[PDB]
Amino acid sequence: KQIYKTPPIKYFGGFNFSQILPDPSKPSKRSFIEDLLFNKVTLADAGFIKQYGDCLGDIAARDLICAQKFKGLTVLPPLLTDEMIAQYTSALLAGTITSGWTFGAGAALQIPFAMQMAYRFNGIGVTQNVLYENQKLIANQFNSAIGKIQDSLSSTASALGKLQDVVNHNAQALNTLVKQLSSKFGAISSVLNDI
Amino acid sequence: ASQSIIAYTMSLGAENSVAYSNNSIAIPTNFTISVTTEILPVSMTKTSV
Amino acid sequence: SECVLGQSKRVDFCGKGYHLMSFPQSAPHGVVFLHVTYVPAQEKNFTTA
Amino acid sequence: SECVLGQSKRVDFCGKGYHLMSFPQSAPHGVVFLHVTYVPAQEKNFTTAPAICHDGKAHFPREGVFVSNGTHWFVTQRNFYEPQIITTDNTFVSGNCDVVIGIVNNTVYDPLQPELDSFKEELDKYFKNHTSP
Amino acid sequence: VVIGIVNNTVYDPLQPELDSFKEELDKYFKNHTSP
Ligand SMILES: *[C@@H]1O[C@H](CO)[C@@H](O[C@@H]2O[C@H](CO)[C@@H](O[C@H]3O[C@H](CO)[C@@H](O)[C@H](O)[C@@H]3O)[C@H](O)[C@H]2NC(C)=O)[C@H](O)[C@H]1NC(C)=O
Ligand SMILES: *[C@@H]1O[C@H](CO)[C@@H](O[C@@H]2O[C@H](CO)[C@@H](O[C@H]3O[C@H](CO)[C@@H](O)[C@H](O)[C@@H]3O)[C@H](O)[C@H]2NC(C)=O)[C@H](O)[C@H]1NC(C)=O
Ligand SMILES: *[C@@H]1O[C@H](CO)[C@@H](O[C@@H]2O[C@H](CO)[C@@H](O[C@H]3O[C@H](CO)[C@@H](O)[C@H](O)[C@@H]3O)[C@H](O)[C@H]2NC(C)=O)[C@H](O)[C@H]1NC(C)=O
Ligand SMILES: *[C@@H]1O[C@H](CO[C@@H]2O[C@@H](C)[C@@H](O)[C@@H](O)[C@@H]2O)[C@@H](O[C@@H]2O[C@H](CO)[C@@H](O)[C@H](O)[C@H]2NC(C)=O)[C@H](O)[C@H]1NC(C)=O
Ligand SMILES: *[C@@H]1O[C@H](CO[C@@H]2O[C@@H](C)[C@@H](O)[C@@H](O)[C@@H]2O)[C@@H](O[C@@H]2O[C@H](CO)[C@@H](O)[C@H](O)[C@H]2NC(C)=O)[C@H](O)[C@H]1NC(C)=O
Ligand SMILES: *[C@@H]1O[C@H](CO)[C@@H](O[C@@H]2O[C@H](CO)[C@@H](O)[C@H](O)[C@H]2NC(C)=O)[C@H](O)[C@H]1NC(C)=O
Ligand SMILES: *[C@@H]1O[C@H](CO)[C@@H](O[C@@H]2O[C@H](CO)[C@@H](O)[C@H](O)[C@H]2NC(C)=O)[C@H](O)[C@H]1NC(C)=O
Ligand SMILES: *[C@@H]1O[C@H](CO)[C@@H](O)[C@H](O)[C@H]1NC(C)=O
Numbered sequence: 254k255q256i257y258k259t260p261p262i263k264y265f266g267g268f269n270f271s272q273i274l275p276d277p278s279k280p281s282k283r284s285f286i287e288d289l290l291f292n293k294v295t296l297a298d299a300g301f302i303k304q305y306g307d308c309l310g311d312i313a314a315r316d317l318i319c320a321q322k323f324k325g326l327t328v329l330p331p332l333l334t335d336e337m338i339a340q341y342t343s344a345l346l347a348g349t350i351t352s353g354w355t356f357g358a359g360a361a362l363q364i365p366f367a368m369q370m371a372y373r374f375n376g377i378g379v380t381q382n383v384l385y386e387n388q389k390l391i392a393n394q395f396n397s398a399i400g401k402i403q404d405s406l407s408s409t410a411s412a413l414g415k416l417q418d419v420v421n422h423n424a425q426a427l428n429t430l431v432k433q434l435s436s437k438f439g440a441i442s443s444v445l446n447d448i
Numbered sequence: 449a450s451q452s453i454i455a456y457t458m459s460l461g462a463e464n465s466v467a468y469s470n471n472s473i474a475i476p477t478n479f480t481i482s483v484t485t486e487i488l489p490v491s492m493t494k495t496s497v
Numbered sequence: 498s499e500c501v502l503g504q505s506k507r508v509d510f511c512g513k514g515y516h517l518m519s520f521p522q523s524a525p526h527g528v529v530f531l532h533v534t535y536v537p538a539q540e541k542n543f544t545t546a
Numbered sequence: 547s548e549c550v551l552g553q554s555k556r557v558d559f560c561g562k563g564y565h566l567m568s569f570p571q572s573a574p575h576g577v578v579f580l581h582v583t584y585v586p587a588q589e590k591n592f593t594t595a596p597a598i599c600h601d602g603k604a605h606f607p608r609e610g611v612f613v614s615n616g617t618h619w620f621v622t623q624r625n626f627y628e629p630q631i632i633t634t635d636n637t638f639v640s641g642n643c644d645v646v647i648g649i650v651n652n653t654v655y656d657p658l659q660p661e662l663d664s665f666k667e668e669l670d671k672y673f674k675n676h677t678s679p
Numbered sequence: 680v681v682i683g684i685v686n687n688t689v690y691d692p693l694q695p696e697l698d699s700f701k702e703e704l705d706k707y708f709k710n711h712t713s714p
């Protein structure tokens with residue numbers, strides 16, 4: 254219910270969240286891994302203002318969205334913008350790295366991040382001294398694994414096929430629903446004025 | 449004063465930064481036992497034609 | 498609720514390994530979860546009783 | 547099964563807070579659960595440490611966390627402020643204080659200590675009176 | 680009653696205290712034999 258924020262001092266016991274946190278300097282406020290994900294799924298439009306002054310002309314000869322619109326099939330925009338979803342995701346992330354789980358149960362309660370990871374290690378039955386005796390290794394290995402993720406999403410699109418095939422199924426269903434108007438259904442004509 | 453339809457960009461929540469540091473903790477000194485209702489459908493009407 | 502706002506004992510539900518924590522990231526029509534898991538790496542044999 | 551017949555550690559599965567117990571009530575075509583939850587309500591800041599150094603040996607809480615009011619150090623349980631004086635029965639040892647980042651210096655009490663020391667004063671007051679013959 | 684149980688020593692952390700308290704006692708006794 255609250256929007257949490259990361260503090261001005263980006264230090265978390267050597268854990269480097271700067272790849273997954275917001276970037277205040279960028280016009281779209283999403284993270285670096287989010288900017289990767291938003292280039293990896295390519296959309297059948299977001300319902301943004303296809304105003305006639307755009308595609309009354311040569312555009313609809315090579316644009317399936319204006320062709321569908323002339324048949325009354327239209328896409329409505331989501332209630333939450335991708336910047337609104339970035340603000341929620343930023344609050345969930347700032348909540349996690351500053352407050353542990355306590356922001357789920359009630360008010361957020363700050364804890365140092367290396368003591369959060371200790372509480373966690375006890376959660377998996379590894380005694381908390383095993384974190385602190387290894388904190389430089391655990392952090393550098395986490396920072397390396399967040400690196401592997403970034404590079405993996407840099408290498409290929411195929412991994413996001415699960416979100417793309419939802420987009421492709423709605424695109425295919427509407428293109429079919431247009432093609433179905435080609436059918437005669439056994440009448441003298443497909444096109445209605447020729448009756 | 450009078451009532452009318454306004455339009456607005458919706459607010460997600462209160463802005464609420466947190467006093468984080470590498471050597472401070474907040475601990476609860478008191479608690480509230482809370483009761484919250486959660487409601488689920490389990491059936492709908494049986495129907496025949 | 499269970500992998501971001503908590504830590505979960507539930508096997509596989511937050512990735513392969515013992516779960517520590519997870520970070521949500523938004524995507525077009527979806528969410529991506531970056532789960533962090535503790536995985537045992539270099540075992541030795543021992544006698545036990 | 548998991549909120550009425552049990553207790554759930556699944557976060558926000560049985561309402562917000564930490565789950566204590568829940569009561570089913572019937573309704574037309576459905577169920578109402580009255581979930582009961584412990585919610586941590588009023589909070590206070592404290593300084594904290596990952597470990598204590600005493601005899602060069604580093605110390606960690608068996609259960610709970612280390613805190614200071616600004617002048618004295620206590621162990622307390624993670625979810626509710628009840629301070630305890632830092633004993634060898636509240637804590638366990640590993641390594642030495644070169645290894646743990648952010649470690650702090652405070653005494654760790656031993657509840658065997660006065661129980662032998664007051665027995666040293668009994669042993670001595672007998673040895674000294676035993677000089678009288 | 681336990682299958683596969685094995686013999687080994689179990690250390691007692693109070694034992695070196697009461698052993699150090701025995702040597703502390705006996706040194707007093709040696710002191711009181713001295714005059
Ligand atoms: C941090 O917590 C400490 C424990 O509650 C607290 O120290 C304690 O303060 C009381 C007095 O306010 C002392 O009481 C003693 O006062 C005198 C002098 O010692 C005696 O004549 C009395 O009989 C009584 O025993 C406690 O002894 C003292 N505890 C310790 C360990 O010294 C601090 O005041 C708290 N500090 C802050 C910043 O809140
Ligand atoms: C926590 O308590 C520790 C024990 O008192 C204390 O360690 C001591 O720190 C001083 C200052 O660095 C050392 O002083 C000596 O340092 C070198 C030898 O390494 C000499 O050249 C100097 O002349 C000086 O004598 C002590 O030797 C050192 N003692 C131990 C057992 O390590 C920590 O500094 C304390 N830390 C805090 C933050 O309170
Ligand atoms: C674990 O430690 C045990 C204690 O030392 C040891 O038990 C002892 O084993 C010997 C050999 O079996 C017994 O010796 C007796 O054997 C029979 C009667 O039981 C007689 O023919 C002999 O004259 C002799 O009295 C000990 O009595 C027995 N002691 C006890 C307390 O049971 C185990 O054998 C050890 N086991 C291993 C695998 O380490
Ligand atoms: C807990 O403390 C933080 C800040 O730490 C203290 O801040 C000083 C006021 C002083 O008490 C010092 O000894 C500590 O360093 C509080 O955060 C402040 O919150 C107020 C609003 O309540 C805000 O105006 C300030 O700008 C904040 N400053 C900082 C540094 O965070 C926080 O409110 C305290 N919470 C409780 C419950 O006491
Ligand atoms: C753990 O030990 C097993 C078998 O026990 C060992 O057997 C001897 C080789 C000797 O070293 C004993 O003192 C040990 O108790 C290992 O299993 C064998 O592994 C080798 C390859 O290293 C393989 O050729 C054999 O076929 C394996 N035998 C069986 C029964 O599978 C096992 O590899 C050891 N684990 C580790 C992590 O080293
Ligand atoms: C956190 O990790 C990121 C990389 O994932 C680091 O950012 C890089 O830093 C080097 C050195 O300044 C630059 O050459 C790279 O171009 C940076 N990459 C990006 C994406 O900015 C960052 O420095 C790390 N944080 C810390 C504190 O070391
Ligand atoms: C535990 O495994 C890690 C690797 O996963 C080991 O860390 C590396 O150790 C070598 C030398 O053995 C160094 O060259 C590397 O720089 C280390 N990597 C990192 C990320 O720090 C570590 O030594 C192993 N520790 C034990 C006790 O076996
Ligand atoms: C935390 O400690 C680091 C050094 O590890 C220091 O740079 C930083 O200023 C400290 N910040 C706070 C808020 O304690």
Ligand SMILES: *[C@@H]1O[C@H](CO)[C@@H](O)[C@H](O)[C@H]1NC(C)=O
Nearest residue numbers: 671672673674675676678679
């Ligand atoms: C001193 O020793 C005598 C026995 O020699 C005993 O009666 C007396 O109670 C002892 N007093 C103390 C204080 O030990």
Ligand SMILES: *[C@@H]1O[C@H](CO)[C@@H](O)[C@H](O)[C@H]1NC(C)=O
Nearest residue numbers: 706707709710711712713714
């Ligand atoms: C016996 O104890 C006294 C102190 O009470 C000490 O001064 C003396 O040196 C001891 N005697 C010997 C012979 O060690």
